[PDB]
Amino acid sequence: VETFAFQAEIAQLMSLIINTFYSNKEIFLRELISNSSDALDKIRYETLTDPSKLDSGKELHINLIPNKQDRTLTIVDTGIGMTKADLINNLGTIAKSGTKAFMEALQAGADISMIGQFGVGFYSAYLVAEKVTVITKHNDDEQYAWESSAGGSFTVRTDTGEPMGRGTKVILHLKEDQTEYLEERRIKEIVKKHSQFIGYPITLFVE
């Protein structure tokens, strides 16, 4: 289990989002779903010039899995996934930029709901989660587990759990006053509102 320090800016944006009273929190789901859509595009694009890239899964889709027992909402995709390098880098590199850019955009006006415009929407998850765990498997690399609680650092390890062939799995450990996002009707209501244009199937796994 490796531990890394978030690039300063990133850590800030995180604790900002994590400790800021916002009202349009529901937009976090749109941000995560967006990423998965993009992750799906990539994996697909690579297939157009190489079918083998799909020997790890020919199905391109997104899955929403609420779990009242663990108080966790999980967004799962079968996209490109991330290599340990990309996992560590992507959530410790690009952000130093986007993250700062977006924070500057906040003081300059813009509201939290625009975060996605700065290629760092992912972090909006901390609006409704106290801890976020990321599981990913890239065609080349192995299955890793990224995790952080906006403490300034994050940890990466090899995921022992359930194998997934290919794709990314974002596990949101919801905050106490945010369990409303484990309600089928609510999730469904949100997806219809901000993600009615995703080109990939989105399945909701009720309990």
Ligand SMILES: Nc1nc(N)nc(-c2cc3ccccc3cc2Br)n1
């Ligand atoms: N679903 C998904 N697929 C891929 N490839 N990457 C992401 C992803 C991108 C990010 C880009 C910038 C900052 C954080 C990110 C966190 C994740 Br978890 N999410």
